[PDB]
Symmetry: C3
Subunit: 341 residues, 3 copies
């Protein structure tokens, strides 16, 4: 199962074979570390200088690169997208579980599709439904009445709370928490009153969520993750956030309550986003974005003063904090020269 | 559970029932998605315009809004507050556990109060004391000699280290880690030599801690969390941090060791706070605040520049760096003007 | 058994006996709270006055306090240091586990050295290797074929993925997740296509990793953490990041994919570091550093505008955002003078 032939792979990748079609390929690697049996690629500009010393058994390349080839070669229009596909074909990643661990704790009321795997010490609460081909990693928790769509996989130690819905073909990395009670509290004077959070989380199809990420459930209504959304490690998604289709949310993003984010957005790492607010389609937020105001026009947005050497920074911070006195000095000369000629 | 008559409820909420009083109510909903049997509420002012097509059976409402009643309305002086309680009254949220699960691993030494329930694959180590009504969720870990007070609930997959003390009626969401070792190092020729951390963590009554938060143990003395404090998701509370009664801490907040924060503070999401520093009572640090220096006076403090479209941003950020250029030029200009004529 | 005599201690600790040689020494404690049985120290130069109100059986000390010594004392060159040694040898800090628990799930093909401990409900996958004296905490997951060197300790609820290699004498706190898929996706018609992440994490010797940290696997080649590295809570280290020997990373730092940090660095809390970049040796970045360009010169680097009273900040923000206008107004008038002769 590990290995297939170059010709057979060319067929599946839709590439023109140019070397010997019977090379036995065992895996993908990078140009630098590739050994015999490995296939590689260069999206690379200029690294075709060094194909002669690359030890890979075949190299996915562009037609323009072919003159430079020094081994079997697969010619395509897009070498990077071909890489994605062939790494899937040759994926070494295990599954989080296989079959049902005798040590799993499965409520008698839970409903299981065909070909479902549940790992050791995983806990499945009452009324849970898991579709066909679902895989639940070891140590997972799946709260009451939750639903997990066919094809979806949880890695080890994921926490899904109750009344959560998860789409098809989703992937959730370890340590992640879905549907924790939202940060919402009443008040008299001083001390707080907890408002039960009876909303849910609805997660679309083909959603990928990274590790140690937290997705709070909504107050009354739902917090919603659209189809094909990708979210990296350690994001905070507040109650009632809505994230549109194919939005990418990088690592460490902090997103406040009732934020609506359009489709095709790119939110950069460590961005902090104000809540009860809206960000339109096709907005891009640079790394460390401070998003206080609603974004109503597409395009790319940014904030922050990048790093500088300490000696230099100290002056910069000090003048910034006195931009006021520096402002006024300016208007005083702007007046001294206006009237007095 | 099952519903209750609108009247029964109106008493327990201290409200004026203007309408049918035998209307049956099964839960709470939003105006937008209410149905027959649901009670919604409003002080959402301008939303009296759309009340007629709201499908809720009853609405919580001030008296100024009483003339727009197109349904059984309930009059109070604070609606959100009324909600907050009816919500408790009509709570659906399940319990993390019921009973002692056969699969939970409980040291013969541990002492349990009355009617504690402990989830599946939970692990209670020796010397641990759990109070009356305490609920330990699935996959939880409670370390040696740790005491959890009456009424406190941990959700699934919480990890409590050894010698940690938790007060009464506390709530802790999944993935949260309490009592890990903090930064503790001498330096033996290039490499960091660890110093054992033997303090512990003390959490007061009625504390709510969100998911994937980390609260480090003290070095010798303790990390202390005051009563009625709320800490949201993925906050980092370092060693020896002391947080006062009733303060609120939003998500992704980072507190260095030895920080003391007084009562009734409100720390904006994503703020980073220096260590070995005190912050007085009644201080607000707004979102993403950079807290470098001690705060000795109540009020609101803010930090950082907001978003700008990339085009603008780059110009601004270039200009902000070497303001020492602008500073000198202004100084050089006013030098020739005033002094010289 | 659990305690030893002063005279003996003073000898293993390398200090001069001044006072009683036989009191029972249960353990270390601070000045404010020490008691009979407790040995404390005093690194302060001034607290020497309050030495008399301590109630403790022994105090480590400099010869310059010896006179003001209110009870038995130990004289050394560096107190803080001998404090480390005191604590290093006196602590009752429990081991994450002791021997192998009945509920631990161990695959038949896993390899265990001498005296390894595994905690309750810990799951050890096929092909895994545990060196001598290794300790796996309660609820941990160790993935297929992973290697954990001798002396190494995982605390409760740590997730190690497949093909992860960890060195010797390392320490990983709870909640942490090692070797999760990096954020790698090809975009095909606005749809993200998942690139499998088939590299590993390699972690050296003497590494200490805090709680709720995420360390991602490489796409193809590896993520590498060098010897003697310390990384504290809530950190995100992306795929293919390479962190050289003895670097220190404080809480909740974010490292983008394919970043290279040289050895001996000190990266302050909440710093955010751009990917595909190099930071040379001996770089210190103060906290909330916004690092987007490579660092080629050793030294101390900073960014950020410190906190201001909100009233003052509103003003500072606005002027800064319109810094273009006042760069113009400056030149526009700088010209006027040198043009009006």
């Amino acid at each position: 199962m590990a290995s297939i032939r170059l010709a057979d792979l060319a067929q599946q990748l839709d590439a023109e074979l140019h070397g010997d079609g019977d090379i036995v390929i065992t895996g993908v690697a990078s140009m630098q570390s590739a050994q015999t049996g490995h296939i590689t690629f260069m999206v690379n500009p200029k690294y075709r200088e060094h194909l002669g010393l690359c030890q890979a058994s075949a190299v996915v390349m562009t037609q323009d690169d072919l003159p430079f080839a020094k081994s079997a070669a697969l010619v395509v229009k897009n070498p990077y997208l071909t890489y994605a596909r062939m790494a899937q074909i040759l994926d070494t990643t295990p599954q989080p579980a296989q079959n049902i661990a005798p040590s799993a704790v499965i409520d008698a009321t839970a409903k299981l599709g065909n070909n479902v795997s549940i790992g050791a010490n995983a806990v499945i609460e009452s009324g849970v439904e898991l579709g066909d081909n679902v895989i639940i990693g070891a140590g997972c928790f799946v709260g009451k009445n939750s639903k997990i769509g066919a094809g979806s996989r949880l890695w080890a130690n994921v926490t899904i709370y109750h009344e959560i819905q998860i789409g098809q073909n989703c992937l959730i990395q370890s340590g992640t928490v879905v549907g924790a009670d939202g940060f919402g509290y009443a008040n008299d004077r001083g001390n707080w009153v907890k408002i039960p959070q009876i909303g849910r989380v609805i997660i679309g199809d083909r959603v990928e969520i990274g590790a140690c990420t937290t997705i709070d459930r909504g107050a009354l209504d739902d917090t919603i993750i659209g189809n094909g959304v990708i979210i990296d490690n350690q994001c905070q998604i507040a109650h009632n956030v809505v994230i549109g289709d194919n939005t990418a949310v990088a690592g460490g993003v902090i997103m406040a309550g009732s934020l609506k984010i359009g489709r095709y957005c790119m939110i950069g790492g460590a961005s902090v986003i104000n809540g009860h607010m809206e960000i339109c389609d096709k907005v891009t937020v640079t790394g460390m974005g401070m998003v206080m105001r609603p974004i109503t026009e597409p395009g790319v947005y940014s904030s922050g003063i990048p790093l500088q050497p300490n000696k230099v920074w100290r002056k910069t911070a000090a003048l910034v904090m006195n931009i006021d006195d520096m402002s006024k000095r300016l208007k005083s000369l702007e007046r001294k020269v206006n009237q007095q000629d």
